[PDB]
Design an enzyme around this catalytic site. Structure first.
Site, PDB file in Angstrom:
ATOM      1  N   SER A  20       0.823  -1.175   0.000  1.00 25.02           N
ATOM      2  CA  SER A  20       0.000   0.000   0.000  1.00 25.02           C
ATOM      3  C   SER A  20       0.874   1.248   0.000  1.00 25.02           C
ATOM      4  CB  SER A  20      -1.043  -0.024   1.123  1.00 25.02           C
ATOM      5  OG  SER A  20      -0.450  -0.006   2.375  1.00 25.02           O
ATOM      6  N   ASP A  75      -1.545  -7.982  13.977  1.00 23.33           N
ATOM      7  CA  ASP A  75      -2.752  -8.633  13.462  1.00 23.33           C
ATOM      8  C   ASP A  75      -3.276  -9.773  14.366  1.00 23.33           C
ATOM      9  OD1 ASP A  75      -2.857  -7.072  10.754  1.00 23.33           O
ATOM     10  OD2 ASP A  75      -0.845  -8.046  10.686  1.00 23.33           O
ATOM     11  N   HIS A 121      -1.779  -8.760   1.847  1.00 24.86           N
ATOM     12  CA  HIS A 121      -1.484  -7.512   2.520  1.00 24.86           C
ATOM     13  C   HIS A 121      -2.550  -7.099   3.544  1.00 24.86           C
ATOM     14  CE1 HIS A 121       0.142  -3.762   3.456  1.00 24.86           C
ATOM     15  NE2 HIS A 121      -0.230  -3.042   2.411  1.00 24.86           N
ATOM     16  N   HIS A 153       6.373 -14.801  11.816  1.00 28.17           N
ATOM     17  CA  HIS A 153       6.936 -14.025  10.723  1.00 28.17           C
ATOM     18  C   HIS A 153       8.464 -13.762  10.897  1.00 28.17           C
ATOM     19  CE1 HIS A 153       3.012 -13.976   8.856  1.00 28.17           C
ATOM     20  NE2 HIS A 153       2.489 -13.624  10.018  1.00 28.17           N
ATOM     21  N   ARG A 189       3.220  -2.887  18.599  1.00 27.81           N
ATOM     22  CA  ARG A 189       1.813  -2.655  18.243  1.00 27.81           C
ATOM     23  C   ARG A 189       0.848  -3.727  18.821  1.00 27.81           C
ATOM     24  NH1 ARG A 189       2.106  -2.441  11.857  1.00 27.81           N
ATOM     25  NH2 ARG A 189       3.251  -4.318  12.528  1.00 27.81           N
TER      26      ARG A 189
HETATM   27 CL   LIG Z   1       1.892  -2.837   6.637  1.00 29.01          CL
END
Ligand SMILES: [Cl-]
Ligand SMILES: [Cl-]
Lengths: 435, 434
Positions: B242, B373, B272, B318, B327
């Site tokens: 993005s 996430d 994404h 990851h 985060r």
């Molecule tokens: Cl990102």
């Protein structure tokens, strides 16, 4: 035989094995270096992506799966009684690597006719857009809204195998290409013909002809022009903004509707999609000033004054290509056969005779020859396609062929997410000081 | 003082001179090699662009103009009666490099309230979209149609000087950020609240609160969540799809509306923009199966079975960082204060206790710690934001802050057209042989 999808299914494995072998021996081979200047200069001169469909030859111009523009002109099927190559056959070429037969082009024409229907929500949306919304904006918005028809997006959310991505990408790409002329002509008629209808798709006509019918044109020569135009603008390597944007967005498994819509927003950029319009504005003002019967001498003077005031002749000059862009030559040939007495064409021709020798003499720009954008406007204008804002839409419909051909291949070969590494100025300064 | 545009005008020259000097000395310095593998692997490991707003520190996590997430949490202004950092102040930080004062954030909140109006053609268009058109598609289509408001596009066609590009880009970027919550909430209401109205912008509220009001929520803690969420998803370097897409499209002098719309088509991509939703689907299926009071042992077994069948635990495992994404930690802190007894949150916490140890033991994945996430969906879901298709729209509104901050800088610093060189397989084979 004629089913492109089955032919493609046979070609893919052989190509995956070839790439596998090449990566085993040459995967670690260095092909380039990255400099600070390259990061600040928009990756200029950095070999950064694999894009299979077309390659620029420094002696011949752009090549489509190894075939030069003159070779495509000769070998690709034409419409019955026509002389210009059909875009269908270009697509088949980009997809397969092979020149299609007549039967194959004829089959593809029928496929694109059958798949043409627009959902009613896209019709409504186009019909409600105001006249101040730029045609490229309408094109990209409409294509984005077409993603409700995407069979790839639905199959991905159901967990389909990676080995099958290319099939759904193929289907959606074929649907999109079929639909594009309908979207584009709806936009044209809503903007410049007071919302009158596009009429119906004819199932026995080729894509360009259904396109010209829907635009409201009835002139065989204009249809021939549109075939040639759609063919020659189809692809120009991976590095231009529209190709690269479709590639980048497609690498996140965004479907073809979404990838092509992003690409068009890139194409709408003034540093990418406006060169045709700029040449034509310049030509118009030139001819209004000096008149149609200007002498060689007086035109040569005007060009010297243009250069001596630190300005360029739009459409002239290339950094690597050593002769006239064969895409220009195609158009020039066309004009010499069909509109040799058109005053604007005669100016374009006069400039071809004079500008390169002036640029050669100035000794500044490396290759002093014209590109495709120097010729396309006068031709469109001659047939009554005078709405310059819209020219980028034509380029867009053509460019769909090349970027969707590659997109099928990118998914067939499992190209991953495009993810280069960014740095900040501060970060790069630290990075170079260690070392 | 409070006018961001004037502050920006003073910062720009100093930064142009800095870059000019650095290029004179080190322009030809080699920073990496390109290999065939890199061309086939989507430029993986290739330093390819300059992106100023954020940098990933492999020891800390993402940094915003040098400031870590915990530092931003402390230093950035909060709403009156609130504890979470306002997105306004994050934007100011990304744009200036400086932590804004209270007055500055307050000024920016008012700016975004004033510029919020949608043209009627975009309202009509959103109101006619059918319920089967994905929310990210509606978002991108609407933003593309907003380009009729672009003052950059008009000024460029009139031949404005290169030295002034950034000013118009700033204006259009501020208009776009203002409008985005209105677009996004219109989409939410049309899809999931039977087409009810979004109500009015309130001139004295911050951006997140006007956003939650327009979505139809009236829970103070949800607004606090949305502030934190919009702040922390705002930017993550230039290389994600993005950011890179807005950068690439912007480098052709496509206006911010067009650049951001392209970026969202990239964000809509399953590789994404979907990780939040994927974690939450997996958590839901997990909790259905083993029930809400599952033991550590039984969960540890489930995770071993997941791994031994060659599958991953979504949100964990990851390659990016050495340790937990800050985060994630932000969201975990939030949940511990406001919804500690939520069954789904308690599962998320239980996984944090167990999954990394199992991944450490398996010895396979480089980072056995979770990213953002892994946590975001349970929080949204708790406050009634249960429409998973829509989560990517939230990410989008947040990500506007980071990519538009850089876009202003890219035009201020005269970054040219992004144009790498492509090759074909055949071409690369010839190239390596000669
Ligand atoms: Cl990102
Ligand atoms: Cl091009």
């Amino acid at each position: 035989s004629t089913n492109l999808k089955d032919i493609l299914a046979d070609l893919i494995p052989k190509e995956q094995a070839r790439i596998k072998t090449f990566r085993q021996q040459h995967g670690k081979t260095v092909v380039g270096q990255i400099t600070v200047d390259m990061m600040y200069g928009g990756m200029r001169g950095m070999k950064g992506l694999v894009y299979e469909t077309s390659v620029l030859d420094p002696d011949e111009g752009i090549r489509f799966r190894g075939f030069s523009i003159p070779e495509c002109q000769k070998l690709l099927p034409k419409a019955k009684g026509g002389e210009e190559p059909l875009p269908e056959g270009l697509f088949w070429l980009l997809v397969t690597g092979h020149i299609p037969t007549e039967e194959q082009v004829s089959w593809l024409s029928k496929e694109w006719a059958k798949r043409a229907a627009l959902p009613s929500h896209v019709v409504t949306m186009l019909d409600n857009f105001p006249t101040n919304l730029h045609p490229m904006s309408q094109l990209s918005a409409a294509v984005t809204a077409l993603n409700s028809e995407s069979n790839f997006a639905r199959a991905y959310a159901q967990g389909i195998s990676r080995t099958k991505y290319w099939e759904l990408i193929y289907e959606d790409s074929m649907d999109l290409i079929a639909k594009l002329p309908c979207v584009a002509a709806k936009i044209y008629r809503n903007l410049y013909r007071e919302g009158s209808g596009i009429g119906a798709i004819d199932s026995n006509l080729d894509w360009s002809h259904n396109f010209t019918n829907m635009l409201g044109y009835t002139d065989h020569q204009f249809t021939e022009l549109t075939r040639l135009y759609l063919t020659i603008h189809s692809d120009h390597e991976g590095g231009n903004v529209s190709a690269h944007t479709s590639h980048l967005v497609g690498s996140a498994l965004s479907d073809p509707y979404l990838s092509f819509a992003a690409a068009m927003n890139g194409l709408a950029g003034p540093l990418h999609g406006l060169a045709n319009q700029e040449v034509l504005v310049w030509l118009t003002q030139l001819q209004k000033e000096v008149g149609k019967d200007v002498s060689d001498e007086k035109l040569r003077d005007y060009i010297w004054n243009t250069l001596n005031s630190g300005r360029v002749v739009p459409g002239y000059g290339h950094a690597v290509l050593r002769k006239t862009d064969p895409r220009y030559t195609c158009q020039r040939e066309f004009a010499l056969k069909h509109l040799p007495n058109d005053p604007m064409f005669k100016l374009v021709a006069q400039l071809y005779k004079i500008v390169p020798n002036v640029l050669l003499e100035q000794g500044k720009a490396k290759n002093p020859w014209p590109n495709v954008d120097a010729h396309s406007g006068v031709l469109l204008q001659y047939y009554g396609m005078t709405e310059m804002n819209y020219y980028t839409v034509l380029f867009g419909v053509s460019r769909a062929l090349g970027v969707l051909a590659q997109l099928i291949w990118s998914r067939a070969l499992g190209f991953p997410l495009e993810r280069p590494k960014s740095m900040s100025t501060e970060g790069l300064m630290k990075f170079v000081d260690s070392k």
